[PDB]
Amino acid sequence: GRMHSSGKGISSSALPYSRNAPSWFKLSSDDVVEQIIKYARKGLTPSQIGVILRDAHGVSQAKVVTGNKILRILKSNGLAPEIPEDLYYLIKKAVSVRKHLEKNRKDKDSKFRLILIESRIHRLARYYRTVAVLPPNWKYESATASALVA
Amino acid sequence: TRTSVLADALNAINNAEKTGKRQVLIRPSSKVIIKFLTVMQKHGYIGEFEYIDDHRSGKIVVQLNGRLNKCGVIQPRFNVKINDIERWTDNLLPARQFGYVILTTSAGIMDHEEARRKHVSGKILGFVY
Amino acid sequence: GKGKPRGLNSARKLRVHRRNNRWADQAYKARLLGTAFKSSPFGGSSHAKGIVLEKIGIESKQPNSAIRKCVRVQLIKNGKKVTAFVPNDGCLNFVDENDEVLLAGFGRRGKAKGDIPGVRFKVVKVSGVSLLALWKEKKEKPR
RNA sequence: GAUAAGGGAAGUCGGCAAAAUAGAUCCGUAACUUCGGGAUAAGGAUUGGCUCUAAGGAUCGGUAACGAUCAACUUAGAACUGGUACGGACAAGGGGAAUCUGACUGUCUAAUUAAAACAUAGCAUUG
RNA sequence: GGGUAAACGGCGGGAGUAACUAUGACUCUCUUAAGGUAGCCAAAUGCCUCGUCAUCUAAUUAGUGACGCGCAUGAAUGGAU
RNA sequence: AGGAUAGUGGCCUACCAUGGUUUCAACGGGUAACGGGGAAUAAGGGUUCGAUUCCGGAGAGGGAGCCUGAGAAACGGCUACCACAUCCAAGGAAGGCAGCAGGCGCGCAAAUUACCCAAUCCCGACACGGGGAGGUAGUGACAAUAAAUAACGAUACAGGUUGUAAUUGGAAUGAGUACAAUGUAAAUACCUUAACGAGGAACAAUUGGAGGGCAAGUCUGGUGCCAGCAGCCGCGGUAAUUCCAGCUCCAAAAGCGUAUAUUAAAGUUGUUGCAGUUAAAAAGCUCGUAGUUGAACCUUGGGCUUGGCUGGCCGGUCCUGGACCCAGCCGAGCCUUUCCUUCUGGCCAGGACUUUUACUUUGAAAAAAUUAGAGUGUUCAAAGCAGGCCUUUGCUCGAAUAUAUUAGCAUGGAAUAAUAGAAUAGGACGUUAUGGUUCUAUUUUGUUGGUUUCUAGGACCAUCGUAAUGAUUAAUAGGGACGGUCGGGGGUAUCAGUAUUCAGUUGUCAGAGGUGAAAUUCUUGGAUUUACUGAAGACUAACUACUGCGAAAGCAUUUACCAAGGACGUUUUCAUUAAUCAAGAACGAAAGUUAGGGGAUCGAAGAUGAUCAGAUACCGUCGUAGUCUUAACCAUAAACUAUGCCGACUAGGGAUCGGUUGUUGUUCUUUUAUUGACGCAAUCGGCACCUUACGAGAAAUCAAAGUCUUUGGGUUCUGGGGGGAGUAUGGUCGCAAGGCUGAAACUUAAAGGAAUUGACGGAAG
RNA sequence: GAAGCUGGUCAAACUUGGUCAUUUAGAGGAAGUAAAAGUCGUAACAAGGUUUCCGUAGGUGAACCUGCGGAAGGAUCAU
RNA sequence: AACAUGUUCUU
C-alpha cells in the first residue's frame, strides 16, 4: 500500500455486518436527507457531513437509513460540487505547496513532494475523465489552479 | 497486489498440508475457488469446507485429511485444445494412473478425465495429486 | 515471480528478450555478425591453398621445450599471411620457399592447438601431393 | 583605351597588370563552431516580346455567402513568337584547401612604412 | 632581521649500467637561489642547415605534416589553442 | 472531371483539400535472402538448413525501347547505347552457352565436344516429320541397399562327451576371361551359360589406435626437454607402456581417418526450463507514458419422464444373443417466478428484427512428391505400386489411411477473460391502448384515367396505462477528509556553547615544541606557561543507543515561523481510481568546475627536517587549492543489506520506538479528579535481535536466500569461461574534468566461489 | 505511298557535381597480446611490515603516494 | 628504530 510511499498501514473503518439501522434509531429518512441538505448548503463537504451525522445525530451510515450515499443524495438535489471533493483537496494541497515553494526556493523536499502530489492529481483526473465526471478536455494546470480552490 | 485469488487459496492449502495442519483459512473466496475445491473434494483430496459470509469477498475454512500431495494453479490460463491435454498431463502429473489437470471449459470447471468423457476442452486452470 | 513476464499476451516481450540475449552466445553472435566470412583467414572455408614465404621455428610454451617447425604462407584467394604447421618428424624438409601448400585448421575451430603459440593451421599437401604420402614415401614430391 | 589563332602562369621575386564573376527569382549548400555563425559557402536553373489566365481590395445599400460603384501595382501560371536572343546600354562578388599572425569594430608615422605596431573589452598587481 | 616574482629577472655538469647489438628505465659523483615543469618547435625564435623522414611536382633552398640534448622555445617579460 | 488501359486504380493530367505511416518498431541499413512443398537432429518444447527432381517468381552480358502475334516488353526476335568480342581487300559485315556437350578463369570445390527418338510427353497442315525436352551409354568411394577375401575331414598330438595347438588330403566356389541366347533403337551391364579360372587358394584388406576420457602392452633398440607426439589432461632432460621403429593386441571394415559448418549432449539462451548476497549479473533513488498485469459479486438448487452403452444378476456361453432389478458414464424433454429470437403459411420455409469479442468443439476444403502407415518372396532389402489365379484366349483384389490447419469459411458451448445497457431517464412494454402527422401499396364499379377519408403495411409526435419501474459489495486494494499525536524529515530567520587561531593587557624566567629517537622551528627583542578581555570563521562534544526520521544522498544547540509526512484512531467519503514500468522527468555523499563573499582549522600541490641503499613515501614542521556560504554546474561511490518492487502463506522467543485500547503492593500534583511518570496486559505499524532448521543452499549461511524437477501470483532490470575492454569508433550530454551509449580483431585453460588439512605470519594467548 | 520534316513521349548512355557504402597506401604516434632462465625496485597476499578496497583530485622512473567522502569484502559482531 | 630479494623445469 501507499501508492507514493513505503508505508504499510492498515488503519481503516470496519463497516458493521448488519445493513439495517439499529432499533434505537428513530429519525426518518426525510429528516436525515433534509439534515444533509441543511449541512451541505451551510458549506460542508460530503465527508464532513457524514462526520457531523455520526458525531451528533446517531447516523452510523447515510446509506443504511436513507438508502443512498451522501454524494448521490447531494447530486439529486443539485448540490454535488463541480469538482469532486478528493480531487479538490489534492489541488488545494498542490496550490499551498507551490505558494510555499515560490517563497522558499531551496526546499528541495517540498519540490519532491509537489511532484508526488501533482502525479496523484493527474492520475485521479484521468479516472474522473474516463467515467464522465470531468469534461473530456479537463486538464489540471498549475497557473490556473488558484482559481478553482479560490 | 492480489492478481490471483485461486493462487493464494491453493498456496495456503499446500502450506497448511505440508505442516501437518488439518484445517486452513482462505481469503478471499470466489466461485472459481469453490468449484476447484469441489473438484478436489469429489476425488477425496480434502474434507468438507465451509463458506463464511462477511458481506465482502467471503472466507472459507477447509478440512484437510492428509491425502494431498500438491495442488496448484497454472498461470497463465493457457488455451488447451483436445489433443494438447496429453502433454499437460505428462508434464504435470506424477503418473498415468492418478492425479488431475483441472480445466475451465464452456461445459464448466472439471478434471481432465471428465473433459475427456464429454469431449470438451477449454483453458487450463490447475492440477491436484 | 521469476522475473520474466508470464502474461498470456506477453509473447512479444519474451521473443524480443530472447533475441536480445542470444547476442551473448558466442556461436550465435559469430554466425549473425558474419565474422567467418569477413575476418577469417580462410574466408569461412575448410581448406585453403597458399604460397610458402619462409620457414620459422617457434619456441613451444611452458612447461615444454622444443622448436616447432612452421612456415609463413600467403593465401591465393585473398593474399592473407598465415602461419601453418607441418606435422610428422622430417617434413619441414619437404617444403621449400615458393611452394604451393594446402592448409586446414587444427580442429579447435580457429584456436591454437597444444604448446604451439599463435598457430592456427596445419599443412596437408605440398606441390599437389599429401604430406602423409611423402612421409611414408608412398609418393615423391614432383618438381 | 581596345581586340587577338592554338596553348594557359611555361612569364615574374611574386599572377604585378588584365581577365573571369556579378542584378533578380527558384534550387542546393561542407568542414568547423564561442551555437550567434561559417553562407551569396560551394554548385545549378531561369530572365525578351506579345496574347491571355488567376490571386491579393475600398465605399454605400436590410444565407449581405448579395448587389452597385470605384480603385493601386504586386505576385503566380499558360499559349504564341525570334539568327537560342533577353540583369541585351547602364549597373554589378571570382571561388576553394591550408600555414604564420593580431581576437573582433577602432587608431598612427600630413609629404616613402596601415602593419603582426597602438587601442580595446577581459585579467592581475599597486597606492 | 623578516616578506615579496601577474617586481626586475633566473631556471646545471661528469661518469657507469639490461643474457646479440643498440639504447639506457637504474646507479655513482660534483653542484645551484632554483636547476626549464605543463606545453610547443628547424616556428616571424635552430647556428650547423637547403637538418632528417613523409607529402606535394617531371623536377621543390618553397609549402604542409612529423621528429627534437631546442647555437639561443616556454608559461600575464604570458604558454598552448 | 478527363486521358490512357483489356479493364479497376494517382496509372497520368487539371483544379481542389491536407492528408497517409510510425515504439503493436514506421522509415533507413545488412543479408555470405528467390519464396514455398520440404531437409537434418529430434522425450517433449525446440535448433539449424532448403541454389537444386514439384509449385510460384524473376533473368538471359548490362540498361532501355519495340515489331509480330490471342498471348512476349521474347533475347537460340529486332533497335540503340555501354562493356566485351569475330572477320575485313579498311569500303564494310557479323555477335550473346544462367540450353546440351566442350574450353579458359576461378577457386577447397563438381563428369563425354558419345548413341537414339524405342519409352515419357510436346509441337506442326501432320497415323508418317522434328524434339541434346527426354531417353541410353562414358566419368562417377556424393549418399543408400545386399554383400566374397574362405570351408570340411585324419595322424600323433593336447586337453576335461568336444573346445582344442600344427600339416595331410578330398572336394566346393566366384572375382575375371569367353562359346551362345537374352537384354536393347543398336548396344553395354545385370540375369542365364559351353570351354577356362586357387594352398603361401601371392586371387596376400584397409584405415586409425594400445596412459586416462576410451577397447587394446609398462616387450626390444634408438634419441635424450632434442627430434617429435598430444582435440583436452599431458608424454619426452639416458630403464619413455604416449616420440622414432619391430612384435602382439584393439575398433570399424570395403571402407576408415582429417578439416569446416550445423544438430544432440546445452536446464551453457531456459515458454516448458537457467542464473543475479559472496562464482558473471538488482539501475544511487523516487516519479512516470507505452507494454504487461489487475479483488469479489448476477440461475443456484430441487422433482418427474426418458434414449444409448458399461460391468456383473437373470445367463439365455457359443467370442455372442432379449424384456426385469442394480448401479456407472454421454445424453434429451418437461416442471419449479424461468431463460432458450419472432410472424406468416398450418415439424419446414419465406418475411421483421439481432451488443460486440477472445477461447474451445465439430465440419467443408485444402496438388503430387516427402513423412507416419495397411496390402506385395522387387530371391532379401532399399524400393516400387504392383501382382495372383489348372494355366486359360480368360478371371481377378488394388493403387489404403492419418498427419495439414497460424489465417480465412461454416458450426455446437456459454465456464474463464473482456464489451454494451435505465441516473438531469432522452428508459422498457402496450399485442387487437388512444389521438395526430407523413409515406407506400393490393383492390375496384373492368373500357380506359381518375377522386382521396376509411383502409394494408412501414416511420415518427402527444396523451394515457401497465411495473416490485431502474444505481451490486465497500477489498485487513487504492485515493481523500477528519482527530490527538510523533519524528536529530525539509526551508527561513534567530540564539547558545566551549574549543582552535590570532590580538591586547598583566606576571615570572630558560627553555618550549615534536618523536620510537631526533631534527627542521620558536625563544633574555621574553618563547612556552598564567590570568583577564576582545575578534574571526568552522563545528555542534558529553547525553548518543543493535534508538528516531527521510525516496535515496542524508539529518543532532535554542526559539519562532512556513509548507509537507508515516503510523494510529474512525459505524466519515469516493468506488477499482490499482501493481510494475521502455521513452521521458525530480533529487543525488565526497571530490571537481564557474562567479561573488568568506578564508579560524585542517590540508591535495609545493617547500622542508628526518629515516633509508635510495625514498621526490610512511613520521615531523609549514602551506596553496580545497575545507564554509550564495547563485549556477557536474551525476559519480564498496551510492552496500554487494540482497528490485507489489501481493499471499509457512515457527518459537524476549526486548524496543510510534499510535490506540483495558488495568496498580508504585513515585508524585495536592488531600484526591480529567496531573504526570512508572507498572501490568492487549493490539496495529516500524528499526532490529535470539533460538530452531520443517525448508533452502556449493557452502558460508538464510524468517527469507523458505512455500523452486511435486519446476507457473504480477511485473521491471541485469548475466552467459577468462582477457582485449567499459578500450576503439560513431552519437549524445558537459565550461572542463568527465558522464551515458558502446564493438571487433586478437589472445587464453582456466580464471573464480565456499569450505578442509597443513604450513607460514614484522598476529594474539 | 518510300526517304525525309514538326512537335511530343519513353528513355539507354556520357560529362559534371553531390552523396552513400566497402576495401586500401601512409611519415609518425599511442595501445594490446604472446614469447624457460635480461634490468629496476617490492605494490598486493600475514596487522604483507603505512589494514585493504571504492569514487574523485593532484603528484611521481615504475609499481604507486597523498588529500576529502565512503565500504568491510577487517585486524573489532562485545565493556 | 630498521628488515629488500630468492633462475627454469619436473620426477
Ligand SMILES: CN[C@@H]1[C@@H](O)[C@@H](O[C@@H]2[C@@H](O)[C@H](O[C@H]3O[C@H]([C@@H](C)O)[C@@H](O)[C@H](O)[C@H]3N)[C@@H](N)C[C@H]2N)OC[C@]1(C)O
Ligand atoms: C552493438 N551490439 C548490440 C548491443 O548494443 C545490444 O543492442 C541493443 C539492442 O538490443 C536494443 O534493441 C533491441 O531491443 C528493442 C526493445 C527495447 O524493443 C527492440 O525494439 C530492438 O529491435 C532490439 N534490437 C537497442 N535499444 C540498444 C542496443 N544497444 O545487443 C545487440 C548487439 C547487436 O549485440
Ligand SMILES: CN[C@@H]1[C@@H](O)[C@@H](O[C@@H]2[C@@H](O)[C@H](O[C@H]3O[C@H]([C@@H](C)O)[C@@H](O)[C@H](O)[C@H]3N)[C@@H](N)C[C@H]2N)OC[C@]1(C)O
Ligand atoms: C610482473 N610484471 C612484469 C615485469 O616484472 C616484467 O617482467 C619481466 C618479463 O616480462 C620477462 O619475460 C618476458 O621476456 C622474456 C625474454 C624476451 O626476455 C620472454 O622469454 C618471456 O616469455 C617474457 N614473458 C622476464 N624475463 C623478466 C621479468 N621481470 O615484464 C612486465 C610486467 C608484465 O609488468
